[model samples]
Target: DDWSKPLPPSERLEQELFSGGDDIPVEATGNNCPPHIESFSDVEMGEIIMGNIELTRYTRPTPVQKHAIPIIKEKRDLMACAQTGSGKTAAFLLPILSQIYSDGPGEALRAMKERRKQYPISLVLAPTRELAVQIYEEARKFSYRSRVRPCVVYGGADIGQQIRDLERGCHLLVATPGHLVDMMERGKIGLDFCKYLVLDEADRMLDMGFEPQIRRIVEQDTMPPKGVRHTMMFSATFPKEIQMLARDFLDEYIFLAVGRVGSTSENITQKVVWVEESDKRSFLLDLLNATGKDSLTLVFVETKKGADSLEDFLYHEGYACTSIHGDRSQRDREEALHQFRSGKSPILVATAVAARGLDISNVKHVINFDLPSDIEEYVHRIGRTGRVGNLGLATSFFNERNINITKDLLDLLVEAKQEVPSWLENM
Candidate 1:
């Protein structure tokens, strides 16, 4: 909006934050997606929405955002599948917030003034606490100048504090299923006033056995019926069965697969090496030393004790490192993440809990100290690196324990065009 003045150093730093390159062909087959979208500025959004976009330093609309936003702004229910780190959060939030404050600050401010606990206008459910918190942060950023107030709730934290935020009035609420149900049953909240419902990471919620609670929140009489509420489900891969399961909460939704989201315009070298358990510690130390001392590396382990044990060893070895998992105190986890993100501690040993939807920038490598059994987990782990038009490398320590997974792992590596080991290929 300003022509003469250049962006400040802080804003220039922001420009490099949300990273990804545009090159791959997008596969959007929906009925009403616009013929083209060149950039976020091209979209017919309100002033506040555009301001938020520019403030966030997003160069332009990502493939997922380009296709998904227009269809959603038209009030169409949507079932979207996009890969991790694809900027899916902004795609849904921008349009939804646009319509909420479409009438200007007066309209949104009026709603915010009237809304109290259980009367949220927008509801977003994420499968995990970290994701819920992350989405809430993005929503707050998007709605910052606008009158849409957003709050988040999850099981681990103090319910008392969350209730206080609710009492302050939440125009938008981001929550995990368990906490939502607990609030509803206690009569602390209700879903009746909700106009928009978003189930992010829909596949994970159902697979994690939160379906019953989700059904309770959406299907019960406290909530508006399906057609009355605008619904959108976003995930990395929503299988046909998951789509079928999702139908219970939707009516006439558009199916949009915007293709993969992470590590485009960059090479992610994937390799598997045979290492016995006894030698694993030494090999991992060597790998850490070989990488740049200042670069960030995420090491995934199988158990909580394993993470702690390894972290202790790495500490004694004079390498700066930290660990994160469900078992760690919330404060510790928060500090660990902050340390890792700010590059205070460049090495982070974690579990699968950090595998999905935690966008730690500039992760140069993801080491699978314990090989992933499921192919999807492996994909998501490697995806942590090579994002935002940057290079990433994934290395795994494989031995007899990984034999059962050789076939699937081999296929995935070959599909990604990474070199598969000759021994593993024969296996």
Candidate 2:
């Protein structure tokens, strides 16, 4: 009934906010990648999934979704490179869910009645505990009212509770590398029945030192071999290590890039300011003052010490600020994030690792107090803003210490149509 009704203008406008225009560059390469679908109706989704898609309010396919859907429908392994917040999660989720809806969850449902060790048909591996939970939440929304059931396991959460979640049966599973391996070792979960395998933030996993764990899970005798299963790796950037590892997991995989790899969105106004080390704190205060205090700001620092110190500095300067770092307990970090998200604390200072894969909305400003070592890290940091057609600003403090990223930073700025300062241009 809901599907038959006309879409309200307000809801239509909501869809419009997600639109970054259809003219974005998309490149798909393999022996033969399927042509991108122009509309959701073009994909072979069952009525139930189509209804769910409508409920999700995704009126149109994103650039990543446009191409990845068809390739995945063809049962081909895919390595999709798309920026965060580009609807990358659903690009893989939709096709796999469509197939599951069509095939029915009969196998999974029957297994639940028959076995103690759960064999989920789909396994989505994310790098961090937060990201794993995020993927699980999306899976839950998609699998609602269907026979398909989704479960998640991650570190820092109680294993007993996670085991209880698994005991309820799962058609789709989302997990962090550490806890998933732990479940497998404990004989609570098995990959024997898994057909659809997705590595949501593949590069981040590699960066977080998950290669050995991932290899163990995928190479295990219980898991199906390459070409025997459908594997997908989605990330914004892929280094040599990830590329080398992709070969072992994917067979004749389609390489899909929604935009230039590691390219920041054009929606973010990037500014690189040269400031002396001693003057950074005062300059930051000036920036916050200019941006106004109410708007949400995410400040990235290189180290945990820097993040905590910056939080204290901003708090002393009369700003509501919180810091999230590796040193903080999971509970404390989550609380800091909650406070930031609720706008109780309008400013959040975080180290690089602590901020990965978080989807915080309405982040008007991203300040890089300490520029990262590479352009890729910078791209991810600034990506916190400029999400889903919301305009964003990223200001970076550049000094002699950031000389290594100068050339690449300039190239990225010019590519995204951002203005380069005279000093930065000369440098």
Candidate 3:
């Protein structure tokens, strides 16, 4: 039986907007802050643009924003290694928007506004459909009261609507690599005029196994010559290997790091409970009971089937729970998210597909019902909580199944100064 089916319109939007796949609590280990700039007022170019926006009084760019905006303004390529939620999107978006708005109508600008056709001058490639949509939303907010028109293009939706938006013309296009490439192949969109490119969550894209598609999209596209087009890449971490591969696409790029390069936030508390696989549900139930109804709980599972089963279990247990994963229709996914956000459901169960780059505020606790295969995935999972200055909790269920990853996981926790279970050291 196909569990995924079309949902009613109301339900569809809820799922699309609210539901996320996995539940991992990335803890902020401490006050390990990224470098800080005293104020944006000091940066002449940024200050000039801010003056036009009446934002000159704005002081202090986030670490990533401070470092990146300057280099991008210089027309230099950049590879920023920063955590999710580090304000990286705005880092690039502001500068790009500033450049686009300040520069008088170039060919690309004219093509975007006057031509009324689906050609993009700037591209923001995200790893997931949800992220693509999220970036578009944020970009739109930044473009508000500006000439920049931003649109989202992703798969699993009516292509006709996206095509219509494209025909309306957009200065900035945000999309997932797969869907964007598909559109390119169908002749609905072309990169010929795209001059600026931003790859958000670069590490997650690689982790999701989109390397080949990313490669082809970057290398084979008929966009402007490489040196002519500016590229900016951002991610939580950049290992040496990915750095080598990233070098090919960037030109005279600056490398920037924000926050703890390999660590999470200290404000979030991390705990590990070693239990048999069968005991996880009960332990999580107990954890939820401890959290009470007032706190928002996020639980992570490994598969869609797991999400369905867990949701049923939570519902039967009299907990206000909703589930979202790749298996659910897009509408269902968004609705679940809406319910969770609106406090209709205080608990959410999900899988990895919904985990990365999703921003939901006020998540008090993140429970890992199943450990992910990669350490970075674990980092993102727990990062969901302890957001926006709210203290949070991250609990992990560690068993023999996850033993292979225990060493690396412990190392990360140790580096962040999070308490480590004594027994796991010898294991």
Candidate 4:
């Protein structure tokens, strides 16, 4: 590791390939990079961790992973932007796993020199329970058969079990701010030993009014002091105000914004039909029948009531469906996700609760049965489909209720050179 060194040829090639040319624009300040990786092999990863990479089918680094991994791997504080399902999770996870593997041979991570139960060396704070679970699952995969022990804590579940998970020896912790704060307040955990802290989807954390608690977690530090710890923040969008606010939690952070790699959004065939609110359910039935029956279809609705009603309607009509909403218990939510993922019920109805950061495989189509009024919500709703180089279809039933958002939708459809329905243009 030389301070005044030029990157190797492989590194330069990777940077040229994924430096946001075919993806989102990327701009970084301060210690520009540590060189992007062309392949997982380019990093100092062992066979076990690299095998997990292949198991996850990451043939190469996505733009975010391409750039963010190298920066964070050098222990640099980073603030990055990348859409959900754009491999942002792996961007952060891989480097941390590599560090654990490199650190080596302790029953626990060397970061935690002695065993202190709740005192893990790294913390990943996600805005939602679903995102937290996704990160924890990925952490487990990357840390496979290694000394890196990853665990999670979130509300709406059994705290006793989570406490037990923590007691089992944690090297990395993934959690939502509220639950982590709750645990901290109750003395169930301590963050003093942490050297790495990550805030994934930080915009949502602020939107959900977690700024104060996030402040308490960082500023009110029961963790390592600011300059001493390496903090990395990831988000889909970072308003100037939010970015400014985020900087307070880091020391000399690099800022990066990335978009879909290799134009994968182009891989998704998108269409919007002007359907009445009342006829939306019937519209979805037609789509389900017209599309592949075995391929998974994710239906997004506006409310818990709608998800439940649609699930019942589909079941009575001799079609299987699973539903998830905020109202459902965490156990039911996970169960619904499992059923959908396992293809037990390839048809699933859900609320905005499932709209962000949860990557369930085989989702060939994302149906916005109830289109949101906001374009950002629409983007996240459809992003569930086209992922990991898979061709996808995102169909939205636009009605009067979604009129306010159609202009933005229309612009986006045109940008992708998608067939913008004449009726939508008229709307």
C-alpha TM-score for every candidate: 0.65, 0.70, 0.68, 0.63
Best TM-score goes to which candidate?
A: 2
Query: Which 10 consecutive residues of model 4 have the lowest summed lDDT?
Result: 1-10
Question: What is each predicted model's overall lDDT from 0 to 1?
Answer: 0.75, 0.79, 0.72, 0.74
Candidate 3 lDDT at 133 equals 79
Q: On residues 1-427, what C-alpha lDDT tens digit does candidate 4 reach at each position?
A: 2211222224443333333214555666665567666666676665556656665555778877888888877888888877777788888888876765665433434434532347777899987767888899878666654556799987644767887888888779998887788888887778876878889977656545466778889888678777878888887666554667666887887877675322125657998888887888788889988877578998888888998788999999888788888778978978887788778888889887653434354578888888887776666567555543677899988777777887888888887789989888877
- Write one digit per residue (lDDT tens) for candidate 1, span 263-310: 221257887999999999999989987987668999999988889799
lDDT of each residue in 1-427, candidate 2, tens digit only: 1322222334453443333326679888899778988999997687766766777766788888999999999999999888778888888998998887766554554555643788888999987666777788778666655667789887543757878888888779998877788888888888887889999877666655566788888996588888878999987676666788788899999998876685346568998999889999999999988976568998888899888788888898898889889888988987887788889998999887877544354678999999988886776667566643567899999999999999889988988889988777677
What are the runs in model 3 whose C-alpha is more than 4 Å off? 1-51, 55-67, 81-117, 125-166, 174-188, 200-226, 235-245, 258-260, 263-268, 292-296, 302-305, 325-338, 341-343, 353-364, 373-377, 383-388
For model 3, residues 1-427, the per-residue Cα lDDT tens digits are 1112211234443334333321222222112223333455555443224633332223456666766776777677877777667678778887787777656347654554432446677999987666787788767655544556788887543767887888776778998877777778877777777889888877666655566677877887787766999998887766654686567888766667665565355667899879898898888878887886678888989988999899999899998889888888978877887788778998989886774434344678989999988886787677666643566899999998997888888888787688899988988
TM-score of 1: 0.65
- Residue runs of model 4 more than 4 Å from their true location after superposition: 1-70, 73-75, 80-117, 125-165, 174-188, 199-226, 233-251, 256-267, 325-335, 353-362
Candidate 4, residue 281: lDDT: 77
**Model 3, 370: alpha-carbon shift in Å?**
2.4
- Give, for candidate 3, the lowest lDDT window spanning 10 residues: 1-10
